[PDB]
Each structure stands twice: as structure tokens, then as C-alpha cells.
Design a protein around this ligand. Sequence first.
Ligand code: MG
Ligand code: MG
Ligand code: MG
Ligand code: MG
Ligand code: MG
Ligand code: MG
Ligand code: MG
Ligand code: MG
Ligand code: MG
Ligand code: MG
Ligand code: MG
Ligand code: MG
Ligand code: MG
Ligand code: MG
Ligand code: MG
Ligand code: MG
Ligand code: MG
Ligand code: MG
Ligand code: MG
Ligand code: MG
Ligand code: MG
Ligand code: MG
Ligand code: MG
Ligand code: MG
Ligand code: MG
Ligand code: MG
Ligand code: MG
Ligand code: MG
Ligand code: MG
Ligand code: MG
Ligand code: MG
Ligand code: MG
Ligand code: MG
Ligand code: MG
Ligand code: MG
Ligand code: MG
Ligand code: MG
Ligand code: MG
Ligand code: MG
Ligand code: MG
Ligand code: MG
Ligand code: MG
Ligand code: MG
Ligand code: MG
Ligand code: MG
Ligand code: MG
Ligand code: MG
Ligand code: MG
Ligand code: MG
Ligand code: MG
Ligand code: MG
Ligand code: MG
Ligand code: MG
Ligand code: MG
Ligand code: MG
Ligand code: MG
Ligand code: MG
Lengths: 183, 148, 141, 124, 52
Amino acid sequence: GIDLRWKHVRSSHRKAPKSDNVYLKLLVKLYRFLARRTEAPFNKVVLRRLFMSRINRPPVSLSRIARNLKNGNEKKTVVVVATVTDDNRLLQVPKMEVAALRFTAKARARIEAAGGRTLTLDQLALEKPTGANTLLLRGPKNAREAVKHFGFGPHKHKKPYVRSKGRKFERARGRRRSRGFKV
Amino acid sequence: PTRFSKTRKHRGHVSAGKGRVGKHRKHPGGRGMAGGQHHHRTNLDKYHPGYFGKVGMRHFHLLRNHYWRPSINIDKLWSLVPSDVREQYLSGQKKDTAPVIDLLSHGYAKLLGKGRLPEIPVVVRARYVSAEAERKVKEAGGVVELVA
Amino acid sequence: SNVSADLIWEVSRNYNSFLVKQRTGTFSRDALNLTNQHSRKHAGFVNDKALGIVPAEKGVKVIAKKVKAANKPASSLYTVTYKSTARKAYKAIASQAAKHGYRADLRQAAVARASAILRSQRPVKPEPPKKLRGAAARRAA
Amino acid sequence: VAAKKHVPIVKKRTKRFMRHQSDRFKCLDSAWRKPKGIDNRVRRRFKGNLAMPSIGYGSNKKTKHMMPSGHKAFLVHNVKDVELLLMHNRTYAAEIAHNVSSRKRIDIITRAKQLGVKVTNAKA
Amino acid sequence: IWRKWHVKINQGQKRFATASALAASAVAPLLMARGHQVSTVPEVPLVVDSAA
RNA sequence: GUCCCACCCAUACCCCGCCCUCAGGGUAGAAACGAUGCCCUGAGGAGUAGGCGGCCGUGGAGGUCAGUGACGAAGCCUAGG
RNA sequence: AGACUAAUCGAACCAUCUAGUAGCUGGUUACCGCCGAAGUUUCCCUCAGGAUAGCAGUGUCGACCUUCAGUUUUAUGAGGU
RNA sequence: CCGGGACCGAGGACCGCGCUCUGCAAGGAUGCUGGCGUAAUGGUCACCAGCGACCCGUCUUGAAACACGGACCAAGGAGUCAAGGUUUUGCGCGAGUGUUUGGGUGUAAAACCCGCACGCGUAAUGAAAGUGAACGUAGGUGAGAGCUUCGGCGCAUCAUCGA
RNA sequence: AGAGACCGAUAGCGCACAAGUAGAGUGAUCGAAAGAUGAAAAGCACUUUGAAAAGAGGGUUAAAUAGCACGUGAAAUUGUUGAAAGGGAAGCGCUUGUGACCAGACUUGCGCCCGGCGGAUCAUCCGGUGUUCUCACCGGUGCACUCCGCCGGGCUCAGGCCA
Ligand SMILES: [Mg+2]
Ligand SMILES: [Mg+2]
Ligand SMILES: [Mg+2]
Ligand SMILES: [Mg+2]
Ligand SMILES: [Mg+2]
Ligand SMILES: [Mg+2]
Ligand SMILES: [Mg+2]
Ligand SMILES: [Mg+2]
Ligand SMILES: [Mg+2]
Ligand SMILES: [Mg+2]
Ligand SMILES: [Mg+2]
Ligand SMILES: [Mg+2]
Ligand SMILES: [Mg+2]
Ligand SMILES: [Mg+2]
Ligand SMILES: [Mg+2]
Ligand SMILES: [Mg+2]
Ligand SMILES: [Mg+2]
Ligand SMILES: [Mg+2]
Ligand SMILES: [Mg+2]
Ligand SMILES: [Mg+2]
Ligand SMILES: [Mg+2]
Ligand SMILES: [Mg+2]
Ligand SMILES: [Mg+2]
Ligand SMILES: [Mg+2]
Ligand SMILES: [Mg+2]
Ligand SMILES: [Mg+2]
Ligand SMILES: [Mg+2]
Ligand SMILES: [Mg+2]
Ligand SMILES: [Mg+2]
Ligand SMILES: [Mg+2]
Ligand SMILES: [Mg+2]
Ligand SMILES: [Mg+2]
Ligand SMILES: [Mg+2]
Ligand SMILES: [Mg+2]
Ligand SMILES: [Mg+2]
Ligand SMILES: [Mg+2]
Ligand SMILES: [Mg+2]
Ligand SMILES: [Mg+2]
Ligand SMILES: [Mg+2]
Ligand SMILES: [Mg+2]
Ligand SMILES: [Mg+2]
Ligand SMILES: [Mg+2]
Ligand SMILES: [Mg+2]
Ligand SMILES: [Mg+2]
Ligand SMILES: [Mg+2]
Ligand SMILES: [Mg+2]
Ligand SMILES: [Mg+2]
Ligand SMILES: [Mg+2]
Ligand SMILES: [Mg+2]
Ligand SMILES: [Mg+2]
Ligand SMILES: [Mg+2]
Ligand SMILES: [Mg+2]
Ligand SMILES: [Mg+2]
Ligand SMILES: [Mg+2]
Ligand SMILES: [Mg+2]
Ligand SMILES: [Mg+2]
Ligand SMILES: [Mg+2]
């Protein structure tokens, strides 16, 4: 006997991409070498963020970039390992340079229209191997329809599963004291 | 594809993953929504609060065409004009000419106001218009007139 | 560009027409593949620079890949026939593979294959007749 | 020819792990099957009964898949296949498929004698 | 007879795949690696001067 | 009934060899690699109901081995390997 | 006499609805590897049955914050065996 | 500090730590010698001998049971399919997305092309008539990966106070 | 009339065959089993034994190990021949012994020197061609002490099994 609580316990984080993209395999080899043989934590962070799934890589917008391009950050490099989407609300787009996994056609058009330049993760590794003068960004993880249904219960104010919406669907007993009780 | 399914990993194992004492019989507990008030009450009140009862007045022979009025906010108002002219207006080369946007031709009836508007006069033709949207259009130099 | 040797290796990494996979090991029946193994290092048809050795009627035949004419396969091979001497062919192949930085890591395999080909062209000695151990008593009658 | 020097080969087992109760009924083959009975004595590892196959019987990586001579088997079908063993004559040995004709069998043997590849089944 | 025989796939992915196939049709090593015999062709994008 | 010496053996403890699982490191101005590879170090291995992963076979379809065959394909028997 | 009505009668025989329903008996097909339980809370014309909470597996993400503990010590409260 | 006996030999150019320092017992066995080169060593099968070993499947707190099914062999033999939901993995586009009801064309049940509407999403709340999302650089406070001119700026997310 | 990622004689319609047939029930109705010699019957003339059926010879064929019980002919069960065990069961696991049978490895390789023999040019040089543009090839020149094979002798090294 040895008196252990856990044995042969596995890891909790991904160690290899589930996608079979060949170009993504090349990028993973490149950043695995950079992260192994570079002191910058930026390489380890980007390498891990390359592992993430689509629901763990939400899109970021031009408006969200312009939000973080203030208070002295107009000259830094924005790094987003995700898709980048144009925003219809923003009428004037400032001048910036962006390195992202992929861009939408209209977002790319407006970036090159304003006088910017669109990079690629390989060009980013070629120009700034250590990630100097950069800021990383993420999208809103919890801004998903499925998250509103999570953990439903009494006194939690979540969203229920209904096939339609109307006065005949739910409400009634348990939602007003006029019919029994409330939640 | 049947080559990848869990029923093949159960070959050689008696009871096929359904248990020995509980033998996966035909229909234990009833069919469908049976027992809503008797033995499935805990599920139907922890989840789906509001299944039973009547609320509100009833309507005979509802025609949904009487209640058709899609709406568009004001921050997307400039998105209706084409890109080539929009960039000209935003850049500021006209200084003497204003566009008149017709919401009905694009399929909208009421103009709500949520965001901000640049200081360029416009004219909007809508079936309905909000009070705050009217105020913002007035402070932007424009005017809105009902068209029916 | 969008295509490179690494990409071609990625595409043909799992399965290709030259692969012969079965139990106890995997091999490759490729003309430009030395040692007949399946690996990125020895895959001639994907790398930009590669070597190949084929036995001739009397001596060795050496083929190499010309990087300048990749898109022209009819004239992208440097061929030469060695039929003078074993040592002279050894020196010529070694210099051809390790003097101008053209796959210097394949020098040992390139020379070794030529050695095996020359070893396989000599006349064969006659194998001695087999003996019997337990059937000798039966054959005594 | 002889193969390269290697560590001695140990088998760790020679018996065949026969199936329980296959020596009393003719409807059961001798291929091993895992018993799923609730009160099987073999499944419960009672003393004095048949053993069960485990991952602890595996062989060393150096001597895995190699016959007692020292080579590794390779199935061939014609004279073009045996030429793949040009660089491997101290590690691999050829074996002709059972459906090859006598003419192609003697062609394979003739080529293999020049290349020095050992043939396990040639006396035919 | 009412099992799902045919399938529906996006036209964008169909067009992506046929463009990928055209792009992969200009690489000679893939031509050899697919079992073709192209050891005696001058140019891998073969073009004929409208003789047919 | 009490005390004191020597001696026998478990799948228990100590040392060594081998198997698998888990965990931590090294490998490109590439003389380079089934990079899903190789090398170094440490710990662990019982199990019904049940959960997950990897692999072996059977009938058909596409591609490929320019695959085997009436000088004998498939099938069957065989205290022969 | 609940007797007889083609060896069938306390409601004949033949085909269909019909693969009638069953909280109840019986069975449920190759291999290896890793993890690994419960007969207990609440409600039900409920007690040979279900939902609900609990125990378990798999897929993860953010830290690696340094965080925690079926444990000891010191200071200070309650109890009616 | 001197004897006697047993089991084992993993690794495969040098690198390191040391000593009694022309060298060594110091990061894992080498040297000399004998017989035989075949049934000798080794493997399969049958039998005698020493020790061990109750019949499978199943319900059950408990089965070798005086609990049930099983005389023997060959072939057949049991979680499938459709519609509608839900979470997770891969892929395309992205504030938009979906060609195939239909039309054009065709080497013809294949492939390719075409367009008005329409479905879901972009705005909610009330039984209903109805109304309808910026005081602030789209707010303040405590933690936060990362970056930095070293002062600070602070994604995602958690908590809290406000609009 | 044209087709299939459909089934392949216990399957597929109940029926691949004189199948809604044979057969059962007074009747309404119920309802099977059963494909394959060989390319061509060339389906064994004749002799002999026998009451007959049959047998042995002898014939056709590539084959009668295809003979109208006819392609291939497995298991349950049975006969003969060969080997072995048995004092109220048999079967099985670990480890030797006896008897029967058997797969591997081994039979040398490498290098050097000396002599014999046959050779045919080695280095060098210049002309042309290709190329990784500096290395290669081809055309001629060499001249015994170069190179290249064969044989005999010697030497060193390593190579099977048990100790
Ligand atoms: Mg009321
Ligand atoms: Mg189980
Ligand atoms: Mg059961
Ligand atoms: Mg159940
Ligand atoms: Mg074995
Ligand atoms: Mg039990
Ligand atoms: Mg590792
Ligand atoms: Mg242990
Ligand atoms: Mg286990
Ligand atoms: Mg198959
Ligand atoms: Mg089938
Ligand atoms: Mg052929
Ligand atoms: Mg055969
Ligand atoms: Mg009575
Ligand atoms: Mg009667
Ligand atoms: Mg009655
Ligand atoms: Mg009836
Ligand atoms: Mg049924
Ligand atoms: Mg465990
Ligand atoms: Mg009640
Ligand atoms: Mg109960
Ligand atoms: Mg029961
Ligand atoms: Mg008291
Ligand atoms: Mg009391
Ligand atoms: Mg008391
Ligand atoms: Mg010893
Ligand atoms: Mg000796
Ligand atoms: Mg013996
Ligand atoms: Mg006993
Ligand atoms: Mg009981
Ligand atoms: Mg039992
Ligand atoms: Mg009893
Ligand atoms: Mg019973
Ligand atoms: Mg019985
Ligand atoms: Mg069967
Ligand atoms: Mg579905
Ligand atoms: Mg639409
Ligand atoms: Mg920090
Ligand atoms: Mg501040
Ligand atoms: Mg039939
Ligand atoms: Mg039959
Ligand atoms: Mg039938
Ligand atoms: Mg027949
Ligand atoms: Mg006769
Ligand atoms: Mg007669
Ligand atoms: Mg025959
Ligand atoms: Mg026959
Ligand atoms: Mg018969
Ligand atoms: Mg027959
Ligand atoms: Mg028999
Ligand atoms: Mg016996
Ligand atoms: Mg007994
Ligand atoms: Mg001489
Ligand atoms: Mg001459
Ligand atoms: Mg000359
Ligand atoms: Mg010359
Ligand atoms: Mg001369």
C-alpha cells in the first residue's frame, strides 16, 4: 500500500491542436521553436492561444481595437489570435497596424483605406520575435447565446428553453402571484 | 456512419451498458408529458416555471400583416447610403448638398435613436419616428417628415 | 509563394503512392530515395535537393535534381555513369555530395548504396550442400 | 550473412493462453476470450487456474518482432519487391508469398543470392 | 427508402475545394506522388498551340 | 502457567532486469527529422455496475501497388514451423 | 349438470385491426489500456416503479495567483450526557 | 582490520566528480583456457511423478448448491432508421448568412450557373391600447495576463457601486 | 422499357424447379421441401464369379480422388490400422524426467605481405560537354616501381554451442 489520493492523473490543458490544417501545423512548429528558445512570455502565451478552439477564440472588432488605442497606445502593435470583423457603427477608422490570424474582406478594405497595413503571424515573428511594443487582445468570451441558458434555476434570472415567445408560453403560475406564487 | 459508434464497444459485454439490476425496460414512468402534476413536478417546477395556467385576453382571427413595422436605429442610418458617396460626405467635400433617405424603399417603418450622429444635415422619410430620434435629427441640422 | 518542400511533406506525410506499409516496418519505393525508408530526411521527391543511385549494366548511374528547372521535369535531372573504378566512383560521389553543400548529410548513404551495388555484381560462389540430422537413419535404407 | 550484434532474446512466456473451458466443449475455439461472469474463478484470479494476458508480458524494443536468427520478416511477391532490401541485408529477411508461382520463386531466389538476402523458405 | 441519401454542402466550400484542386494541379512532385508517369513532359502546365 | 535462544515461509518490505501509464527537460545561421521522430530523469500499476482512448477481423465503393494466378486463384485437412 | 353446439364452451371456429400494451420473467456477439460507484435527502393512489439532490466519467478554461488542510498549538464562547 | 558462500553484468567513441596521480577498484565486465560443431543446447506432443484446482450463464446481502436454463454439431440470431431539440469537436463566410420551390445549361438521376421573395440573427417590454436604450474619452472602486520611455497603460473574467 | 455502393438458394417475393403445386380441414381458409456430372454422354464394349442385385478384370476422359445416390465435401457420430494409459469419475495449472518428431546457427569473412600468371594503362597533360560554374565525364598521351584481377604460401583480427 502507498496511501495516495490521486494516481496517473492527466493534464487539464490541450497539448496539440485538434485541427488538421497544414498551415496551422507549420505555424505551431514555428512558435513551438520560438517559445522553446526565447525568454519572452509573449511567445508562450501566443503558442497556447493558438491551441484554442473556435468558441475559445471569439472575434474582435475594429471598435474594440480603437477602444484600446488610446492613452498613449497609438504606436503599439495589436495582436489578436482570432478573426477580425468590421464594425458598421464606426464611421471614421484611425490609422493603425494590425497582426491577426485572419481578416474579413471589408475590415481589410477599411484598414488599407485608412492608410494602415495588415500583417500575418509569420511577418510578426519576422519583425518582432520577442514581441516588443505589443499588446494582446481577446474577444468577449461570454457574449454567446448558449451562455444565457447556463445554470438555469430559481432566483437566477437566466433564459429558459421555449419553442416560441408569447403570452401563452410560460408566464402564468410561478411567475406572478395572481396564479399561485412567483418562482 | 456506423463504424464509429459506442454500440460496437459493448460487444461481448452483457446488458449493453444499460445496467444489470435496472434492465432498461420499455416505458417506465409513462409516455410523453405524463405525470406533470404528480411525479414529474420537481422537474417541471425546478425547470420550466410557468407551464400551467392562463394569462391574458384572447384574439380571434389574428392577421400579422396589421402588425408589421420593422425598425432601424440611428447609428446604422448612414449605412444605407452607398460607400462611395458616404466616404465623400464623411470626408467633407460637398458642404452644400444633403441626402434624403427613404426608409420604406429599404424596408423599414419606424426610426429609433440609440447611438450618436455626425453633424451633417439629412432628411428621413419614415412611417413612425421616436421623440429622441427626432431630437437628435434636429440637433444634427436635419428634419424628419412623415410620408405614410 | 504558398508551396514549399515542408508543405509537400505535410501533404504526402500520411499516405502516398510510393509507400509500402505493413508489419515490422515501413519502406518507400522511390527512385530518389536512399535506404528505402519513409522519412522527411530521405524523401527525395519532396526536397529541393536530392540524390539517387541506380545500377547500370556494368556500373553505377547517379541522378541529381536541378533546382533551376523544378517546373520542367523533362530536363531537371543531372545524370552521370561511373564504370571506371570503385574507389574513383566513391571519390566522385563523395565530392559531388559534400563539396558544394548539396545535401552533405546524405554522403554516407550515397556512398554506401554504390558500395552495395558494386558488391552485388561479382560472380557468386556455390553454396555447400545441406546435411541431414534425423532423416539419416531413414535414408540409410 | 550474420546479423549485427544484439542483446540476448528473452520470451517471458511460451504458452498460448488458451480459453477457459475450451478443452471440454467442441463448439468453443482455443482463441482467448475475456470471461465476463460475475463469479468466474479465472476472472477472480483463484489460485491454481489459468492465467490472464497482461501488458506486463511485453518484450524489449530491441528484440521485438525479430526471429531467433536476428532478422525481421518481410513479405515479398515478385522480383521488384525483393530489391527494396538492398540496403537491409543484416537486419531484414525475405519471405515469398504462398501464391507465387515456381518460376517467379526461382527468379526471386536467384536475385536474392546475388544480393545476399536470406530466404527463410527456399527449399521447395 | 426515406433515409438521407444525398447531402447538402456550402457552395463556398465547393468553390474553395475546386480552387484548391486547381492550385494543387500545378505541382509536379504531387503529380508523381499520385502515381502518374510524367518523366518525359517538358512543362507541367502543358499548353497546346490550338492545333486541336 | 511464566521467561529465554536458534530456525521455517506471503502476491508484504529492500536491490536489480523488462512492460505500460503519467509528469518534467534537450534536439535548425539545420552534417536534417516515419518533429505523430529520437535522447535523459522520476513516480505509479487490484476492481463489479459504468465512462473514455487505441487497435484486430467480415460484406461492398473511390484511388493506388504498371499487385498474384490453369507451370494452379479461392476453399478444406494437418500432436509441422 | 353451467350441460351440449364437429376430440374445442362460465360465450364456437376462420381472417384482419396486430409487430395490440406490460412499473413483470429470459437473452443481449473481438482484444488491450486508464479512471471508478450506490442502496441515502425531498415529492408522487408511491412501497417490485419515477423525478430531485448526492457519488462517477469525459471535454476544458484562468491561475500557477502561491493557494489550501477529515491535523496539532495558543487565546476566547456555548452544552446538561 | 582480515576470511568463506550465493544472485546479477543493465549501458556502448571521449566530456564529469576524485585519488595513493609515468597511472587507478574514479559516470554499469573484462582477461586466459577446455570439449563439441551436432539432436550436443533448444522447441512441440504423449505419459508417469510432487503441490494446487468444486459447472457454466443468471437474479441476489449471500450460488459448486437439495435455486432455475443447458444431450451434441452446423448455419441464422438482438440499440437500427426518420423528424424535432440540446451541448461539444472540425470547416466556410461574418452584421450578415442559406444556390437546388424554381429557371439556364449538360459528355444527362452527375457536374456548373442564375434571380424575386423567404427563414434565423441585428431591440426589448406589457394581458392590451402602446412606448422604445450615451450626463462622462460608453462611468467609479478592488483584483487581473501582457506591454512599457519604468512613471504607468491595463484584454478576458470575478465582485461591488452607479447610468 | 432502362437502371442499382440492394440479396445471392435456411438469403431475396410463399414460389430461381410440372408453386398458389403436393398435402391437411365438412367448410371459411392453412400451405411446404426441392438449383450445380463433363468442353462433348464420349452414361463402362466384352470376359469371368454369382439365383438375382452386385463384384473383379478390362475400357472412355486431362481427371471416375467427376459413375445419373454424380463440382468442391467441414463438424457432431462410426469402422480398420498405428501409439499409449486405467485399484469407486475424467478434464486443468506450475516444474522436471522418459519416448516420438523438429525449426535455427554453423560450413568463414576482412585486411596485409611475399612469390607466380593474364593483363591494360595509373598519375599527368590538352580538346569538347554538362554542372551545385567547380567539379565531373568523354577524345587522344602514358610505359612496368602505376593500376587491375586470379592462384599458392604466411601473418593478424573477428566469428556457433556448453563450461
Ligand atoms: Mg384564480
Ligand atoms: Mg465491465
Ligand atoms: Mg440483463
Ligand atoms: Mg433506469
Ligand atoms: Mg508466444
Ligand atoms: Mg459476487
Ligand atoms: Mg516531452
Ligand atoms: Mg506497488
Ligand atoms: Mg486496472
Ligand atoms: Mg474490407
Ligand atoms: Mg450486404
Ligand atoms: Mg500476370
Ligand atoms: Mg492453392
Ligand atoms: Mg354450480
Ligand atoms: Mg365437444
Ligand atoms: Mg368464463
Ligand atoms: Mg384467431
Ligand atoms: Mg417487439
Ligand atoms: Mg484505481
Ligand atoms: Mg395524489
Ligand atoms: Mg422509494
Ligand atoms: Mg426482480
Ligand atoms: Mg441532565
Ligand atoms: Mg437530554
Ligand atoms: Mg438525567
Ligand atoms: Mg560471472
Ligand atoms: Mg575455444
Ligand atoms: Mg531434449
Ligand atoms: Mg485440494
Ligand atoms: Mg433470498
Ligand atoms: Mg453461480
Ligand atoms: Mg443444500
Ligand atoms: Mg425462475
Ligand atoms: Mg433441464
Ligand atoms: Mg453465425
Ligand atoms: Mg438530429
Ligand atoms: Mg435575408
Ligand atoms: Mg504583473
Ligand atoms: Mg488612470
Ligand atoms: Mg426460399
Ligand atoms: Mg439446401
Ligand atoms: Mg420460401
Ligand atoms: Mg449439389
Ligand atoms: Mg466395373
Ligand atoms: Mg449386370
Ligand atoms: Mg481433379
Ligand atoms: Mg470432383
Ligand atoms: Mg451422400
Ligand atoms: Mg461430391
Ligand atoms: Mg469426425
Ligand atoms: Mg488421462
Ligand atoms: Mg478428481
Ligand atoms: Mg605476382
Ligand atoms: Mg588491352
Ligand atoms: Mg593510354
Ligand atoms: Mg581518360
Ligand atoms: Mg605501354
